[PDB]
Design a protein around this ligand. Structure first.
Ligand SMILES: CCCCCCCCC/C=C\C(=O)O
Length: 102
């Protein structure tokens, strides 16, 4: 293996259901891409408080959408971890470019 990635890259739809789930995201969660595509990212990987605020962002972003950055406490195999996500359209899908800033 010649190289690795430094960012958790998850692609979502307006409902928050996962479409792509890169390799670093699997290592953080123990769940492979095949398991989580079609699954809701909010209920899977964040608490109710974070899920609430995030789900409104994604829904609001798909209405009047401008690229933005967000800090979201994510729920991983080693407890919660804070990620900076750079979010933007590809318009059906939302690319989430995350960095563990814990
Ligand atoms: C362990 C996988 C974590 C992927 C979670 C995606 C978070 C993307 C954040 C999107 C909208 C927001 O909250 O403003």
């Amino acid at each position: 293996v010649v190289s690795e990635a430094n960012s958790v890259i998850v692609i979502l739809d307006r409902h928050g259901n996962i479409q792509r789930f890169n390799r670093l995201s699997e290592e953080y969660t123990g769940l492979k891409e095949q398991e989580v595509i079609g699954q809701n990212v909010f209920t899977l990987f964040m608490s109710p408080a974070e899920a609430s605020a995030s789900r409104r962002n994604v829904t609001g972003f798909f209405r009047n959408g401008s690229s933005y950055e967000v800090e979201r406490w994510i729920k991983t195999r080693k407890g919660q971890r804070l990620f900076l996500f750079r979010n933007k359209f590809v318009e059906i899908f939302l690319i989430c470019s995350g960095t563990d800033i814990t």
